[PDB]
């Protein structure tokens with residue numbers, strides 16, 4: 618099948634951040650501010666301030682945005698960056714959800730142990746980089762994309778960044 622890019626969010630400007638909201642948590646917490654713009658990471662990225670205790674297999678924080686063409690789309694991609702602090706252990710289990718309908722997509726398709734990760738550099742600082750690619754079916758009536766950042770025995774108190782959110786549809 619062939620696809621074109623329908624929507625893309627690169628967070629080049631802080632005014633994009635108002636389109637995103639905190640859609641909840643599960644066995645994890647947001648700090649304050651929960652979500653903010655960061656202009657160094659990714660030349661602009663969405664910064665989630667999180668606290669994951671690292672005691673269970675599913676410790677989730679979630680952000681969301683409306684996308685008018687979401688019901689026409691079939692592939693989602695995004696990047697997650699985590700500061701390359703020494704000693705971090707555990708697994709990320711990132712996924713996403715389409716709503717209305719709370720349609721969970723990509724469950725356990727992009728899981729990554731943090732210990733053996735690609736790195737990327739911004740501003741002379743290193744970040745662990747995790748790419749997420751999810752295929753799904755055209756889903757009628759959906760209008761919101763929720764991105765779920767999930768830790769699995771990943772004890773971490775600090776920022777996690779999202780960037781390069783891309784949605785593709787068929788030509």
Ligand SMILES: OC[C@H]1O[C@@H](O[C@H]2[C@H](O)[C@H](O)[C@H](O[C@H]3[C@H](O)[C@H](O)[C@H](O[C@H]4[C@H](O)[C@H](O)[C@H](O[C@H]5[C@H](O)[C@H](O)[C@H](O)O[C@@H]5CO)O[C@@H]4CO)O[C@@H]3CO)O[C@@H]2CO)[C@@H](O)[C@@H](O)[C@@H]1O
Pocket residue numbers: 640641642643674675677719721724725
């Ligand atoms: O407010 C918005 C929205 O929230 C809804 O509630 C959400 C809630 O906030 C959470 O996001 C919750 O999250 C669940 C995930 O969707 C998913 O179901 C996840 O499933 C995991 C599971 O926990 C477990 O880790 C499992 O591990 C397995 C593994 O699959 C394999 O079988 C292996 O062999 O065994 C292990 C161990 O058993 O893997 C699953 C993923 O594949 O569980 C999360 C915790 O429950 O989802 C809720 C919705 O279901 C609602 O309040 C809604 O009303 C509201 O709109």
Ligand SMILES: [Ca+2]
Pocket residue numbers: 627628629658659660661662780781
């Ligand atoms: Ca960016």
